[model samples]
Target: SGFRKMAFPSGKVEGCMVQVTCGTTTLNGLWLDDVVYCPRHVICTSEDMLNPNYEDLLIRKSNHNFLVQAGNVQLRVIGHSMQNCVLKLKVDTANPKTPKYKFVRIQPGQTFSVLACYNGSPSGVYQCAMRPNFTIKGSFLNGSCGSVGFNIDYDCVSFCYMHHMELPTGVHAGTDLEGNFYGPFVDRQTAQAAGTDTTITVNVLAWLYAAVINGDRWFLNRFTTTLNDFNLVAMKYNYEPLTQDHVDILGPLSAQTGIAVLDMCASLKELLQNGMNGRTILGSALLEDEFTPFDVVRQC
Candidate 1:
């Protein structure tokens, strides 16, 4: 299944021809995610291809219907490594309502080609404006070989995190995110180390948590939320019912046995400096509403 040919509007304008060729044998039938490789050549306006031997393969220009004397035309190729593509040559006219089509051939020299410029009409995917009512009319390669399924709902859904970040000096930091990232939390930490942002930290935490609980994911809604979405997926995948049954039947039994073994495991780690997992000590109390513990960046 070597894709040794390219499809385009053949000759490009002024000193421009869609020169096509193979780089190597491995460069054929390539997929979007498939590991791309070098070939004998990539189609360009100039004959000076990347590989050696580069000779200007003299061409007999066809003043055929596909040939355009004026403007230019562009096409989108379809999915799946087809045997060949088409190059529509039409009157290079302005945006004339009635344009023409031509075909360009980019056949592989050997079994396949490394790279080639493709041109053709694509069957694309579109998203729905209403809920549960969508159009799967998107035309991909119709298989796993070429195009991928696109989802608007899933990608549009936003996520929130109380993530952990590490410092260059070995410090663990905590922070939150909102809509498009405004800036980095490390910068805040740097400002704090420089003895600034004492009051701004409180303001930031308030807005962060408020946005998180209100957004699509952290979810305080009575209806479907992030956890609800998770539950639905789990049910569909049979994970919830199966795991619950397994846990109900075996969890208590394992817990009873495991409880007696914890002390022994801790004893084994007694010599480590980090103490297996360190706990956050509720140090001194803050003046009433002082916000002393309000923003402490310990390794929590």
Candidate 2:
């Protein structure tokens, strides 16, 4: 036949494989997507269901509602080892001329924390790269190295976090930390004499000394009514009683902004009620007009 006769789209394989006739027969090439395999999955009944009122409490708490929505608005990647003491961006996704975009490259053993201000005002993803130092490299700097490690799976969050936590105490050792809202949640990275690092690469020696203080100021301000409503719920009911969830606001949200699981649930419910009142993006919904578009609005 002719080259165009092949149904597969890799043009036509000209090499010595099934693409060419073996013996007297021609075989069809398989597409990667056409193959089906079992996806990883398992049912979990929440190991906590073995509690005192497993079923009774479930029914009783059914009336409570909390839900929030968050998205993969940001992206990040990092190094897997504490050995590499340096990190550089081999790719930058923000450049318009490139095929890979909608992301900013994060170096290995790095940390990405910042305000969502990619658009004009805080309306985009934030990222940073960072690495700390330890005693292994002390032989080079006379005493202390400026490399970092990759270990964030240990401590992801803190309770009632006050300002000025595990911050880079110095600027000489391990200064590759980048981005904003950066904090030192755990000490999985190697340790040196606080902050005596002096090695500076594109970001190797640059201190990741930035933060996101009310970056989404507009978004935060818009939800005052909802905030009040949320506070009221929290005041009345502590973070427990997880069953009560907002009917509308239940989705993959609340992970951002360091909100507690239950606290975020209540906040989302308030956001939903506010949404029903005809407002979008942050803030509360006043019932001055119609409660919800679906609800019949009463004449003012």
Candidate 3:
């Protein structure tokens, strides 16, 4: 028989024992739970533990994929070999070769904050690479093994500078804080300082239309009829409707101007009835051809 039989003391044989027999010599080997030592030709549970040739082997290995939404994110190894690993954290940028932040080595159990604030780091994919420290590997028998790697997780959050109530969708409004009464911006510290007046005038019709598009029924409810009247008056003045300069004001049409325009139209209709002796007026004035006295009053 070519097989050699070896006896071990009772209760001495533990997890995964190996025996090598050469000629008349029988040698016993024990498996290291976390390491693969090539001298004995024992394989590790993770195949990555077999080769230690390339640094990228460690850079490209990721054992965990985690997502972080907004603030600090803690990164650590979840299971086996975590004690033997060190990690590097990087933020992927427009140029993959140049990361936004300098890479730093991290030890297991340490915390890494994603810091996905709008004023801070722009949100995108972040990577963490875990590699076995070769210096630490000297503690064990000479051997080569693969490293662990990281995958990107979404970490950034978009925020509104204006009060959420004012700009719920983070879109800039046509009206400003001084005239429109919509916003006193919330995050002024990170954005432009508050109390700064914008030169932009409110485009009454466009504002209402945007309200309709955004499903902001509250704004439309408050200003829809006003917008209609403004357009009617604009047409009466022979100005193109929906043009930015047609209204030429920073706010909605004044209540007095609105009533005056209504009165002026009524008066002209009455004069026409009286001049024609109550005859039916068959033809109508072309909106673009008409010029109203109300146009002059609007300037004041």
Ranking by lDDT: 3, 2, 1
Off by over 4 Å in 2: 1-66, 70-113, 117-128, 131-195, 202-300
Q: Write the per-residue lDDT of candidate 1 for residues 139-173, one digit (tens) a residue.
A: 12211111111111221311111112223443222
Q: How far is candidate 3 from the true structure (C-alpha RMSD, Å)?
A: 30.0
Candidate 1: RMSD to truth: 24.2
Tell how far residue 16 is off in model 1, in angstroms.
21
Model 1 poorest 10 in a row by lDDT: 106-115
Least well predicted 10-residue stretch by lDDT in candidate 3: 129-138
In model 2, what is the error at residue 178, expressed in angstroms?
19
How many backbone clashes does every candidate have? 26, 34, 4
- Candidate 1 TM-score versus the reference: 0.16
lDDT per residue for candidate 3 within 5-54, as digits (tens), equals 11111111122122222122222221222221111111111343334322
TM-scores of all candidate predictions against the true structure:
0.16, 0.16, 0.15
What are the per-model C-alpha RMSD values against the true structure? 24.2, 26.3, 30.0
